[PDB]
UniProtKB/Swiss-Prot annotation, chain B:
Stated consequence of mutating residue 442 to W: Slight delays in replication. Virions contain primarily p51 RT
Covered residues, full protein: 600 to 1153 of 1447
Residue intervals of the Reverse transcriptase domain: 46-236
Gene: gag-pol
Marked site: Cleavage: 442-443
Protein name in the entry: Reverse transcriptase/ribonuclease H
Organism taxonomic ancestry: Viruses, Riboviria, Pararnavirae, Artverviricota, Revtraviricetes
Effect on the protein of changing residue 541 to D/N: Severely reduces exonuclease activity of RNase H. Probably also reduces substrate binding affinity. Modifies cleavage preferences of RNase H. No effect on the endonuclease activity
Amino acid sequence: IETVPVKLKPGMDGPKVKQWPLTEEKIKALVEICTEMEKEGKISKIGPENPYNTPVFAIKKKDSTKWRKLVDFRELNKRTQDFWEVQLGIPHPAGLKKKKSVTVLDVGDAYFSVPLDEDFRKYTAFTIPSINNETPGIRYQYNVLPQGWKGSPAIFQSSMTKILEPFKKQNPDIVIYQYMDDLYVGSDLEIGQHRTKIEELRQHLLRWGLFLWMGYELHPDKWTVQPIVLPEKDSWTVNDIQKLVGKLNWASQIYPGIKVRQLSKLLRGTKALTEVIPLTEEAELELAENREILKEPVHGVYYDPSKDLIAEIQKQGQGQWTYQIYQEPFKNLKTGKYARMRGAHTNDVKQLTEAVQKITTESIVIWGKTPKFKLPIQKETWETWWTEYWQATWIPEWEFVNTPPLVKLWYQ
Amino acid sequence: MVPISPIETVPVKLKPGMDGPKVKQWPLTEEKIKALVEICTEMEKEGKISKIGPENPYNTPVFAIKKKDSTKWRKLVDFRELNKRTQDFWEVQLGIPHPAGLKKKKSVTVLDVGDAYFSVPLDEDFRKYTAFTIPSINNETPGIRYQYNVLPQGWKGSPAIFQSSMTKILEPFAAQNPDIVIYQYMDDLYVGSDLEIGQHRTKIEELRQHLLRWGLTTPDKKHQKEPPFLWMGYELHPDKWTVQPIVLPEKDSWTVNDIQKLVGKLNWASQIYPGIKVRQLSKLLRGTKALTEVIPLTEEAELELAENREILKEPVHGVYYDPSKDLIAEIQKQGQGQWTYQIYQEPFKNLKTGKYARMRGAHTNDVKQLTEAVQKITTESIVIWGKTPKFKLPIQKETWETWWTEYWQATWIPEWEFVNTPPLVKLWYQLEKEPIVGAETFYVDGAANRETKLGKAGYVTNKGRQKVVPLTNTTNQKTELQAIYLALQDSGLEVNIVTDSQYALGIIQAQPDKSESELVNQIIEQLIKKEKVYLAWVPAHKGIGGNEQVDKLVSA
Ligand SMILES: Cc1cc(/C=C/C#N)cc(C)c1Nc1ccnc(Nc2ccc(C#N)cc2)n1
Ligand SMILES: CCOC(=O)c1cnn2ccccc12
């Protein structure tokens, strides 16, 4: 009914992406889920004349007994046309990040109400593998807007608008933002009735047609940043001064006015690393001038919607992780630190996977897009484990860092 | 007649912008022509091909070849051109099962489905592209033109479409008979089960009746194939599996091609025979690529070869998978970046074995390699069994804990226990987190002239100890490492070292226990002898005491 024509971008074929190995429990889950989707008309079995593939796996969101199918559409998304057709795109709301509470809803099930263009369905092909390839993999494609595909929120947008219209007119101060399968709803209300307002929202979706009941509570107004701070000490060792001059040298790339000359003079001669050195007056003045410089914002920092966001992460030890989001080197758009647990105390890779998810969430809230990650992990280790910890319905792009950054110690 | 269910055709297209083949038919001898006409007349009467009119523009060449040293002929249609122009397909069978993931079976029966193999209909709209021409006797009449109504042998889409069609037919049978397994390859259909023999035979008769729904007839005379089966380089038996015989040739002289074949056999053998090593043999294959060249075997390659011969002296078999039991994976370090592993359920009976080799890299260490081996085995295990094995690893729990908590990267290995089975993986050194009180402090530097390759490396200390060494044929990076080496060599058991070298810090922060670099190896050997080492970095050219003084010394 009223199918929107969709195309790949010029000169591109559909995705052929290998299905990665799935555990028995994930395969069983996916067989059950897909058997039901097939009965409901959402997917159909396909024949050998469809060469395309996109990987699929299954996740369990936070505190739930049910598996959720997750298709990794990253390749299809790159290869799918940008949508200029009717809408020129929404300006990203700048007020969302200022709200006291933002709840995240998974609305993706609504997409299944819209048929997918018959000519484009083949590009949604996916396979449920069998253990040890003992039986033929089960091959399906979508008949309707799939969750995880960038085209789905685009094509459904005129429907979502009508759905939320009474809630928006009734609650003009509440910010609603849609990214992929997620709806982000912010408000300044007391948490008890914020929760009522979102539940009021759920009903509009629940009443219309047909994991929605879930919600993920954020408080972005309390989100912090990490300015460059220098130690305040009564006695400085040679080693302390060396680390200070190192950190200032690094900072001077970000802040031009930074000077190390007087501090660098302090160590004069070759002294024991642990020896205490009294600061000269010139050294104290310089340090003071440097502190004041570091209280000001970085010069010439601006977000460009046309450039990728890059996120770097450092493992600081004891469950602590620092990160920076930028576009251009030394102009950081956001920095942050997670000192936290949420299980994972004996698992580094789980911690990193949770950090990646938290950073991507912040990115979506602030800029409305996901960044490209530089991960401090060996590719094979990440690729083996990340799907075990993944609770998000989207997936960002990543690359791997194999050389230890010297700058880790300065974000500590 | 008994109505039969038609096989639904798969719609097929040429690649975008491509037309069908038009390829000249080469002349044939009068004999070949008579043979092809007969062959095609038979094929045509059973409906496999049909005569076509002059209007079809397409052509694919046809040949007449022979069976083995005798009188009979076979038709070969060369589809190379049509294949280039045909769309890609999804093949159900690719990524074959590993025997180690199979389940033991009391009975395995084989059925002959060769008549289905040649009977699957081809999409009506695509048939025209399959056109071929038997040349006329003497070229005095139009050649006889035919096209295919069924999947042709040699055509790009035949295997995928045959597999998909057979799958669709078998699916309801398999689904409603969870007590059997089925596998189909070419003209054979295999059915295994644990059923009482009476029940098993009944199942086979039911399958035969099922297949009859599509008109596929299975010869009543029973199959001459029974276990053990030779399949895909393996031997499958009802209760055990192995690789087909591996016999290592004797020769006084070895050739590139001979060595490649040897390594190939050894790699194949390594999935069952524990402890197979290819390092020194694959080493002889480096960067040559002239297949007739004779390479003298190193003493190391000879040792490896003899070690392999002993491993291969008598047959070894794997058992099959029991889903009711835990999978255990045990790994051993073999030296030279080589690792070996066994996967088992009950002690002393392996499901399979295998090996892992260290990645190409400038610097490395045993803990990283063991971690890599674990992730590889983990991924293989997910493929074969759908679950991660519990690991038995030659590294102490305390060693692992010290490693991962201090390593600059996130790292993880899944549930595992220490097995004390030398050689053990250990940390050969760990650097201090804070400067050492009472330890001498060495400020090191090195520099080289990029033109002449002359350089200097050295240190100065808080005790007034100093050294500068002149160096030739060196680089700034090498001099920076040489300076750290000198400080290690000349200091006591506890030492603080201050360097400006980001290059050296990056190497040392990677924690190598072994290097392609001679100098890094010497540094590692010295670190191993220390009780405590603190390594401090400072930026160059900043006026940092002991750093200039040594920087100035080493510059000129
Ligand atoms: C992959 C496969 C190849 C062949 C046959 C290929 C050929 N030629 C026969 C069968 C039935 C299967 N499929 C499965 C599936 C699950 N367990 C098993 N176990 C199993 C198979 C054969 C023997 C024996 N002998 C024992 C156990 N086979
Ligand atoms: C055509 C190839 O079919 C199979 O090998 C096969 C193995 N299990 N199985 C179950 C249903 C259908 C086909 C199969």
